[PDB]
Amino acid sequence: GAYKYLEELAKKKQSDVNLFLSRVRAWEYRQMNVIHRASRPSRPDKARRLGYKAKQGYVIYRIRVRRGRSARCTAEERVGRYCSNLRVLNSYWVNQDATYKFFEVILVDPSHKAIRRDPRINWIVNPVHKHRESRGLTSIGKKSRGIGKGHRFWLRHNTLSLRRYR
Amino acid sequence: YVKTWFNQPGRKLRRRQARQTKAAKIAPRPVEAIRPAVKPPTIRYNMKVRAGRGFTLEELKAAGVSRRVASTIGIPVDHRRRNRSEESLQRNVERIKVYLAHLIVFPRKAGQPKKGDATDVSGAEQTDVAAVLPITQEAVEEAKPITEEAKNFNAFSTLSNERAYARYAGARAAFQKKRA
Amino acid sequence: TKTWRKWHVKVNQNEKRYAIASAVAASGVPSLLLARGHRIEEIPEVPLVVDD
Amino acid sequence: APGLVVGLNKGKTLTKRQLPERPSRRKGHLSKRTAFVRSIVREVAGFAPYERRVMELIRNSQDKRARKLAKKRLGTLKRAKGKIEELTSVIQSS
RNA sequence: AAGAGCAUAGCUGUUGGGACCCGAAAGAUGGUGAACCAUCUAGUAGCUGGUUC
RNA sequence: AUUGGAUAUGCCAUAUAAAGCGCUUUCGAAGAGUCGAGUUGUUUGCAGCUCUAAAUGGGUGGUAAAUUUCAUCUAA
RNA sequence: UUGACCUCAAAUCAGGUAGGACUACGCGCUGAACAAUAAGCGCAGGAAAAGAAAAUAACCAUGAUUCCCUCAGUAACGGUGAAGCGGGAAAAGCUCAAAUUUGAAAUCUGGCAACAUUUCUUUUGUUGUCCGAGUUGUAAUUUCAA
């Protein structure tokens, strides 16, 4: 496959080729709206490994956020507020300038008939998965609120336990 | 705030009805799955034997059942655990062996015996696994003679100095590499 | 009045068994039965045993 | 294990069985395919400026300054020493 | 140096919870109107008053 | 009155089939502005800011020693 | 002179979907004069969140998460205040990206005609056919336990 070359290229973020392409694309994204639909992801490898498939129901929205709460998280919440009939799967980074952080956000149509019949993604249809980022359940949100497995990561103390026999 | 326990008899009765409902749902098969014999991991508890999560892939390989068949017939499989002392190989092996020996698998598709599952089916009975497969504690020894060679073995000859030898091993090893 | 008043009280299990035995033995003394208020003026025998 | 508690042999004396190697530990192993891909991307993408700066530091035998500067860029000594050794192999390869 | 403690109940004292009851301006949060309102609040009370055969 | 799914039964099915496990003559891809470092805020965690990775590498600890072995796990 | 592909519009075009209320309990952000609290803002379910180790440990080793007892008012910090181990309640495992099928895009939405089925003339599909989506990658196989 041609994907192995893609993230190896994507890792070299200070390369001249990526450095040029970031700026020309950043100049363009500044001149569309702050949020706008994209026909296809600018990094197909990144979206693909984040759960995107090139089939009806999946959709990509590009967005930019002022720098200076995480920039990643604010991207999803604004997209979810915009495309309010969708369940937003994930998000990933693309570009910066001196002032902006650019993100591309993957959303899945919960009511679409192609998504509902695909067992790998039906879990997003179930009602508990609506507006995850308002609840902080996405990849960045789960990491932001410190949830993980380890020693490194309230109302079980302030409560007073009074058993029947004490 | 203030956690009260006035539901304690109620919660106990809920679990009873949970077990009775669960058991009656799957009556033919035992209510409780089997667990391996495992040793607690610390110097305070390492002498004891308790029930672990599942049998490691070494043991199912030795016992002659695949990791797929074991899950179907009620043998839990633990992949994280790895068993290194071949007794832990052993003690879990016949544990699987005797479980298979007392196990009776009802044939699928209208009771024609497939492979070696079983032939009789009227022997359907729901038994406590810890009855047929209780977990025992360590086998302690009793009434062993002689060992007067251990008599001359005057304990601290090992303990006091080997503990000092262990303490000073790093300094000693540094010394040997230094003058070399 | 709060619900978390101490409603239930522990008793040593042996003490509970002690008292149950003492009440059982006390059930075999006709003087104790009469004082408690039972009408055993014509009972054949205390303790009283009927067949299986 | 001398049937005892203490020492740099301590433990309960048993016959350890040689456990097999599990695929999780395979991580870090080189694949000729990915090694080829890394060769391709290195040849086409180029280098960031900071390793560019340090390599003529190796070229003009300015090793100590380059090592210190590489440490400043990345953050750890092992990352720095890993960096300079691979650039040097690039230097002799060129 | 030939172990005396463990558990339960009661009484009394003390420490903390609104803490024997009643009572000070104030402060915060969020509102309404062109100061007011509701919660935090049962506050700070080192005192005043009362405290039952 | 529906329904619980099992039991038996009847009819289609398609079934030129695929999968599990002895072996390997080997190959094993494994998630990047992410990890991390410095810095500022706030309750190690997270966040802004500048830099920015690697493949037996990386995280984490018992050891050592301030580095080391060893153990354990495989993040984004 | 025409046709593709791409970018963007427009429709009182066909089909869908979002708002609002409840908020005891869930998960967030913010946060006071106590308190990671009250108030404020956002968003769910019958439960939610967490969850199949980048976890423990230093042992004869443990083995997803959640909860209870214990650890323990201990470690640690300077009044705050855990966790590993042990016992118990409950137990259930897994799915993608990373390689090809190149002797066949084998995949999928929708329009139309039939066959059905229904908690149900209200539901849910199937077959055929057409069209579009899709090689900037839909299927099959594989997920490190391999």
Swiss-Prot record, chain A:
Q: What GO molecular function annotation could you give as one example from this UniProt entry?
A: structural constituent of ribosome
- What Pfam families does the entry give? Ribosomal_L15e
Q: Name one GO cellular component term.
A: preribosome
The transmembrane segments are none
Q: Which UniProt keywords apply?
A: Cytoplasm, Nucleus, Ribonucleoprotein, Ribosomal protein
Q: Where is the composition biased (Basic residues)?
A: 142-152
Q: Which InterPro entries match?
A: Rbsml_eL15_core_dom_sf, Ribosomal_eL15, Ribosomal_eL15_CS, Ribosomal_uL23/eL15/eS24_sf
Superkingdom of source: Eukaryota
BP term (GO), one:
cytoplasmic translation
Q: What is its main location?
A: cytoplasm
UniProt keyword Ribosomal protein present: yes
> Any idea where this protein resides?
Cytoplasm; Nucleus; Nucleus, Nucleolus
Region feature (Disordered): 134-153
The record makes one more remark, namely:
There are 2 genes for eL15 in S.pombe.
Provide the assembly information: Component of the large ribosomal subunit (LSU). Mature yeast ribosomes consist of a small (40S) and a large (60S) subunit. The 40S small subunit contains 1 molecule of ribosomal RNA (18S rRNA) and at least 33 different proteins. The large 60S subunit contains 3 rRNA molecules (25S, 5.8S and 5S rRNA) and at least 46 different proteins.
Name the family: Belongs to the eukaryotic ribosomal protein eL15 family.
This chain's function reads: Component of the ribosome, a large ribonucleoprotein complex responsible for the synthesis of proteins in the cell. The small ribosomal subunit (SSU) binds messenger RNAs (mRNAs) and translates the encoded message by selecting cognate aminoacyl-transfer RNA (tRNA) molecules. The large subunit (LSU) contains the ribosomal catalytic site termed the peptidyl transferase center (PTC), which catalyzes the formation of peptide bonds, thereby polymerizing the amino acids delivered by tRNAs into a polypeptide chain.
Curated annotation (Swiss-Prot), chain B:
Spell out the PROSITE patterns in the cross-references. Answer: RIBOSOMAL_L13E
Q: Which residues carry this modification: Phosphoserine?
A: S157, S160
Q: Which InterPro entries match?
A: Ribosomal_eL13, Ribosomal_eL13_CS
Could you give a single Gene Ontology term from the biological process aspect? cytoplasmic translation
Pfam families annotated for this entry?
A: Ribosomal_L13e
> Localized where?
Cytoplasm
List, in alphabetical order, the Gene Ontology terms for molecular function in this entry: RNA binding; structural constituent of ribosome
What are its GO cellular component terms? cytosol; cytosolic large ribosomal subunit; preribosome
Keyword terms, alphabetized: Cytoplasm, Phosphoprotein, Ribonucleoprotein, Ribosomal protein
Q: What does this protein do?
A: Component of the ribosome, a large ribonucleoprotein complex responsible for the synthesis of proteins in the cell. The small ribosomal subunit (SSU) binds messenger RNAs (mRNAs) and translates the encoded message by selecting cognate aminoacyl-transfer RNA (tRNA) molecules. The large subunit (LSU) contains the ribosomal catalytic site termed the peptidyl transferase center (PTC), which catalyzes the formation of peptide bonds, thereby polymerizing the amino acids delivered by tRNAs into a polypeptide chain.
Give the family this protein belongs to, as stated in its UniProt record.
Belongs to the eukaryotic ribosomal protein eL13 family.
Q: How does it assemble?
A: Component of the large ribosomal subunit (LSU). Mature yeast ribosomes consist of a small (40S) and a large (60S) subunit. The 40S small subunit contains 1 molecule of ribosomal RNA (18S rRNA) and at least 33 different proteins. The large 60S subunit contains 3 rRNA molecules (25S, 5.8S and 5S rRNA) and at least 46 different proteins.
Q: Which PANTHER family match?
A: 60S RIBOSOMAL PROTEIN L13, LARGE RIBOSOMAL SUBUNIT PROTEIN EL13
- Gene name as annotated: rpl13
Curated annotation (Swiss-Prot), chain C:
Where in or outside the cell it occurs: the entry states:
Cytoplasm
Q: Which domain of life is it from?
A: Eukaryota
Similarity section: Belongs to the universal ribosomal protein uL4 family.
Q: What does this protein do?
A: Component of the ribosome, a large ribonucleoprotein complex responsible for the synthesis of proteins in the cell. The small ribosomal subunit (SSU) binds messenger RNAs (mRNAs) and translates the encoded message by selecting cognate aminoacyl-transfer RNA (tRNA) molecules. The large subunit (LSU) contains the ribosomal catalytic site termed the peptidyl transferase center (PTC), which catalyzes the formation of peptide bonds, thereby polymerizing the amino acids delivered by tRNAs into a polypeptide chain.
Other facts = There are 2 genes for uL4 in S.pombe.
Read off the domain note: The eukaryote-specific C-terminal extension harbors a nuclear import signal and delivers the ACL4-uL4/RPL4 complex to the pre-ribosome, triggering uL4 release from ACL4 and incorporation into the 60S ribosomal subunit.
Protein name, UniProt field: Large ribosomal subunit protein uL4B
Species assigned in the record: Schizosaccharomyces pombe (strain 972 / ATCC 24843)
The record lists the lineage as:
Eukaryota, Fungi, Dikarya, Ascomycota, Taphrinomycotina
Curated annotation (Swiss-Prot), chain D:
Cellular component annotations (GO), alphabetically ordered: cytosol; cytosolic large ribosomal subunit; preribosome
Q: What is its main location?
A: cytoplasm
Concerning Gene3D superfamilies, the annotation shows: 60S ribosomal protein L36 (1.10.10.1760)
Q: Where is this region: Disordered?
A: 1-31
Does the keyword field hold Ribosomal protein?
Answer: yes
Subcellular location per UniProt equals: Cytoplasm
Supply one GO BP term: cytoplasmic translation
The answer to whether keyword ATP-binding applies is no
GO MF annotations in UniProt? structural constituent of ribosome
Extra remark beyond the main annotation: There are 2 genes for eL36 in S.pombe.
Q: Which family does it belong to?
A: Belongs to the eukaryotic ribosomal protein eL36 family.
What is known about what this protein does? Component of the ribosome, a large ribonucleoprotein complex responsible for the synthesis of proteins in the cell. The small ribosomal subunit (SSU) binds messenger RNAs (mRNAs) and translates the encoded message by selecting cognate aminoacyl-transfer RNA (tRNA) molecules. The large subunit (LSU) contains the ribosomal catalytic site termed the peptidyl transferase center (PTC), which catalyzes the formation of peptide bonds, thereby polymerizing the amino acids delivered by tRNAs into a polypeptide chain.
Q: What name appears for this protein in its UniProt entry?
A: Large ribosomal subunit protein eL36B
Organism equals Schizosaccharomyces pombe (strain 972 / ATCC 24843)
